[PDB]
Amino acid sequence: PIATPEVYAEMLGQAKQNSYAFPAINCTSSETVNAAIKGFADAGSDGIIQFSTGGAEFGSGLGVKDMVTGAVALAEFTHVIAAKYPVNVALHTDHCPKDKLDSYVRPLLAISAQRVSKGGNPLFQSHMWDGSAVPIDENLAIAQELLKAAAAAKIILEIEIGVVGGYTSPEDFEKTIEALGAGEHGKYLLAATFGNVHGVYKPGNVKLRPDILAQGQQVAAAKLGLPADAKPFDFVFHGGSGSLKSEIEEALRYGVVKMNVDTDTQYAFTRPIAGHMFTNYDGVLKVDGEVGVKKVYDPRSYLKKAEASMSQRVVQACNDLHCAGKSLTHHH
Amino acid sequence: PIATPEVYAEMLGQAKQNSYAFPAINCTSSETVNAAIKGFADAGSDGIIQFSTGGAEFGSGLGVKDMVTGAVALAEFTHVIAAKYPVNVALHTDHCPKDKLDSYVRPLLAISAQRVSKGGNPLFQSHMWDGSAVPIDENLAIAQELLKAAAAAKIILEIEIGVVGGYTSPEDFEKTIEALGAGEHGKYLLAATFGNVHGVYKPGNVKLRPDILAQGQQVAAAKLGLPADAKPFDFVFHGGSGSLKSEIEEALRYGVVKMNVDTDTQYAFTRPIAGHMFTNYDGVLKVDGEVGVKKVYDPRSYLKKAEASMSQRVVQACNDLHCAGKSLTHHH
Amino acid sequence: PIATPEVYAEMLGQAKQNSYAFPAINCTSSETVNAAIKGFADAGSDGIIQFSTGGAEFGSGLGVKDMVTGAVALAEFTHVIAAKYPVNVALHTDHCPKDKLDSYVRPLLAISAQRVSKGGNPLFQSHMWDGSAVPIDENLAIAQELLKAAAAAKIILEIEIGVVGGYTSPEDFEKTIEALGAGEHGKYLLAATFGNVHGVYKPGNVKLRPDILAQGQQVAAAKLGLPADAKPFDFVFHGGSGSLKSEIEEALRYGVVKMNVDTDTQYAFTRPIAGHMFTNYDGVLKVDGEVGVKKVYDPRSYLKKAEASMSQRVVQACNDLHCAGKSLTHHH
Amino acid sequence: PIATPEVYAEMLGQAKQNSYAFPAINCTSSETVNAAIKGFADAGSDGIIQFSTGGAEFGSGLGVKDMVTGAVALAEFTHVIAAKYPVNVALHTDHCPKDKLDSYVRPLLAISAQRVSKGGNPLFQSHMWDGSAVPIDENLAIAQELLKAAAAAKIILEIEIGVVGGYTSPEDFEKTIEALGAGEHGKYLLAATFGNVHGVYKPGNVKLRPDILAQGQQVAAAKLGLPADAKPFDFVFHGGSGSLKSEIEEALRYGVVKMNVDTDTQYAFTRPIAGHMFTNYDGVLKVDGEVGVKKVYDPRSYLKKAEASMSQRVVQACNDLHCAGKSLTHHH
Lengths: 332, 332, 332, 332
Ligand SMILES: O=C(COP(=O)(O)O)[C@@H](O)[C@H](O)[C@H](O)COP(=O)(O)O
Ligand SMILES: O=C(COP(=O)(O)O)[C@@H](O)[C@H](O)[C@H](O)COP(=O)(O)O
Ligand SMILES: O=C(COP(=O)(O)O)[C@@H](O)[C@H](O)[C@H](O)COP(=O)(O)O
Ligand SMILES: O=C(COP(=O)(O)O)[C@@H](O)[C@H](O)[C@H](O)COP(=O)(O)O
Ligand code: NA
Ligand code: NA
Ligand code: NA
Ligand code: NA
Ligand SMILES: [Zn+2]
Ligand SMILES: [Zn+2]
Ligand SMILES: [Zn+2]
Ligand SMILES: [Zn+2]
Ligand SMILES: [Zn+2]
Ligand SMILES: [Zn+2]
Ligand SMILES: [Zn+2]
Ligand SMILES: [Zn+2]
What we know:
Four copies of one chain form a homotetramer.
Chain A: H1 5-17, E1 22-26, H2 30-42, E2 47-51, H3 53-60, H4 67-82, E3 89-93, H5 105-117, E4 126-129, H6 136-152, E5 156-161, H7 170-180, E6 188-192, H8 211-224, E7 235-237, H9 245-253, E8 256-261, H10 263-279, H11 281-284, H12 294-297, H13 299-320
Parallel strand pairs in A: 1-2, 1-8, 2-3, 3-4, 4-5, 5-6, 7-8
One 1,6-fructose diphosphate (linear form) binds next to α3, β8 and α10 of chain D.
Active site (chains A, B, C, D): 94
Keywords (chains A, B, C, D): Glycolysis, Lyase, Metal-binding, Zinc
EC number (chains A, B, C, D): 4.1.2.13
């Protein structure tokens, strides 16, 4: 099913308590949503499907190019699909900067607030406010008001401090606890930067500093008067693709509950499509006066392979993050 | 917008009256739906999006493989998208044989009946019952009961007499009018076979006999006591891909209001994907120890091109069928 | 065997007498030479292998880029190969303009003159002087001196009047007979231009005017005091690829004895190489950390297919030109 | 130039004395010969071009399939080309088993014996007798008679003890010295097996035991009454492709003077051809009614790239084997 707000909160609480995390898979289409959910289900795992501003625009089609439309359309699709799987699937929106709040996160929050006012649940279960490009005080001012609105709509807010490549300071960690508390005013997720980078580069290139996350937890624990081993933050690991297994493991120890994956699932989706086009070149092209071969230019022929391959990469993510076999539905 | 039942009936009435037809484009995904609707809009045309049993299964994902789920999920997606376009978009389900009625058309009819009972409109605006594999009397017995159910849910029924390749007889035309009337008991569309073939073959191979359709109209007109030039049937032209322009023109003269297209839009969708994989071979594959190029293995990079190409083929269909520039929204 | 000068003269005499012609296939390598000769043999035909200035440069390798070296190296290769086939194979050099005479045709003539001085036969059996870019009188002045040198080395000279696309005038035909005679001072071949074009374009684009050739023969016949149906010129048809069968047939009627083919045999050679790379993409590339598949990146694996395909196109040329089954070895 | 027998003997003597070796590059065509020689020249190195039985058959064309013809034709080509480069190029034939001696090595020896009888030099400068599939005594009996014939024709014989994958024993090393001496009855090259394997596999898979070669030299030195550090054998390293740099270095220390390379130069040749076909897919194929693009289906367009790439891999071999910059022409 789609994760209810209560189930999603329980998911994130259980992950933190047990030092595991969920994959948050960027999706752009019916096929990619289907691939992600099947991956979660094959791993016996709960999971998160997320739409970026560009993913939402793409989902709305070239004739519309509207983020809200694409996110709503893909979310409605996902609601129907997820009902047919035993695992819990949460819907999330990715990076939304200041100049897109009025045309992405705010209108989506309003849609969910209307649903909740009628006794229903929100359309999305979390939204990201990415204020990393503005000063920390402005970032957290906007975050505080969005957190109030989100919590009232039964939605978790993700925020970002520091810019992910394409480090978070002790004072920025302190300011975050001061402005937002530690969940008692509404749950929030913190994308803290620790040398992580969006994209996939050669092994060695990306140098992660998970000690930054350890330090952040210690800073928060001290502020809140908690024991030194407390983990008050629910961290989000952006730029998960291409990471070493050992790096993921270390991040889990310090309270990462959500690792975002896009690039690696993109490669997994595209890889069999490329293979299909090459091995069926004279079927997908009308060559030498011939009319091609419908069986292989039917988009389903290669998109099924794309789907299955992306699902396998999602299963790998669930095993890397130690959420495999832990779905809160306990269907086993 | 999505075509209301009233608008869809008006669409088909206007098409018949003016000797034009609408494309019915088989779709399987968010991208193909988006491509089809953008094509209709670019042509200033109303249009039909249809899901086959296999298309619906595909739309539900490999982890579900359920026709109803896929059709509902894709229909819900389409409802959100179509609201953002000025043209009218009708939703249809394609070939449903006897052994799939209980797991496709009937449950979908029930969903729409529930919507209509609450003062809303149906999810789909037409459904196909394909009884061509059973004797004509059984075909029309099932058709009569489905027509009653469909009309009560504000839905048009498509039926089929004769098997499309992969001819309809005067007596079968007569039996159809006798069993179903001529629209006064609910509108229905008739897929009569006249040498048409699903798929795309070399020019010349497919030999159409549109005189069969002319004869059918004359048979119906005589039965109903109408003038010899009356067109009591709303015909559906299956196997539209690969047809000569002149063949399409002749079919229009005899009351074809709906021409189904799948194979040609499949080729149009896939063609730029093939091209993308070849020209970006060392970006979509990790070759010689390199890590590929995200910008070109991002599925959106080639799927945008696929979408645009399929939309162009849909525009061509609207111009071939003479529905271009005739959308009943008259947005111009 | 390699055509002796006597056999080559007999070949061209028999072709003219019987209104057929030989293909002159541009070659660039051991594989293309092998493909051409096998094509002649499969057709039971004599034939001509020719090297352009660029083909010769290519044959010499990137480390040499010397026309004489490449032509000699490929000719020596061809002498060994042709001895193993029952058909007669003549060696020819293609377009040599004024500024390349000193570095292509003249040094090659000198090599053959040395061979002949020792009681042997020439290395090449014909050479082309292409003076079409200089005024006709200068063209024919150079031609006359080259004809003397060529005939003394038992070599046939090809000349060109008019520029082939990328028409020959009555006066230019007259001047040619006046300057060179009609074979009694040494045989020569005349590349007269008649709307022919190097390269392959869409059907219709190239508009041939074989009546120009008919007129040329009539002009020569009148000059020589021969009957009006005499064919004093041995014509060469440049730009043979892409021609209609009927166009080739008409050219034969007017004394074409040699039709040059390059572009169509290039396509035939490359076509299966392209196919091989696509269907074996993950064998010819080291992908995803794998080491490829030697069996398919071994150049012989695709070059055998290239060879066989080019040979088939050469067989087609022999049947188009009506030289198939007519080899002067009469091996049958 | 082509290596004279005297120069080739000096090459191998200098290599042994200075602990370096020459690449022996398998070639199959004019393009591959040109690529190999250009690689030697670019590295300022002497080198060896070799033809296998299959390479020779391929070189003769599908219409001939004769090893002697192909080897002679390619050798004659190579003689013309090599004269234009400052470095010394030796010609060699690769693996010839017992049942092919009468149709490969023996007839080639006879051709060279005839040349030498007339005061000239042999066509090839070395030939391989591969008797590894027969018992050692029979192998060396045939080797002794072939060595006499080869030496009389100014040709070096290569022999093989042990079968290369797809170890040489102290007694087999001893028997070799006993039967053939240490060069005083004619120079010979010894392909001793030491865990080497033809082909290219993943790193680690091939486990070389160069200590076998060290042991062989010690066994020979003891037999001949030489100091323990003497290197009486000139070793040949079959299966050179895919080897670690450090493995090559160790083999050099023990008297390898010739390392055979085929698979890696095959990959280098094919790799840009594959790339060319993919990036020019709509030029090398006639697609959607178009006629392709001659500029990219001209075989020279991709074969130049193939040549250059193979030459680069040959330069790498010369640097790996430490023969780069050491050509005995000292042209610098
Ligand atoms: O952290 C993430 C994944 O990083 P990688 O897994 O790609 O390293 C996501 O949050 C990215 O920001 C997202 O893929 C960007 O999507 P786009 O704006 O292109 O639609
Ligand atoms: O008439 C039609 C189009 O014919 P063509 O345009 O393809 O000739 C449709 O009704 C086809 O039956 C449909 O494409 C079959 O879809 P599938 O069962 O493969 O999902
Ligand atoms: O007439 C000919 C063939 O014409 P097509 O058969 O190609 O139309 C030949 O003489 C051409 O001039 C020759 O292919 C040019 O070769 P290049 O200078 O590129 O090495
Ligand atoms: O040692 C060699 C190279 O090994 P690799 O460099 O390929 O490992 C050669 O002697 C091989 O036996 C030769 O490539 C076989 O050629 P083929 O019989 O296929 O025409
Ligand atoms: Na990353
Ligand atoms: Na069709
Ligand atoms: Na041409
Ligand atoms: Na090897
Ligand atoms: Zn991110
Ligand atoms: Zn459990
Ligand atoms: Zn159909
Ligand atoms: Zn209007
Ligand atoms: Zn030409
Ligand atoms: Zn005969
Ligand atoms: Zn070997
Ligand atoms: Zn020196």
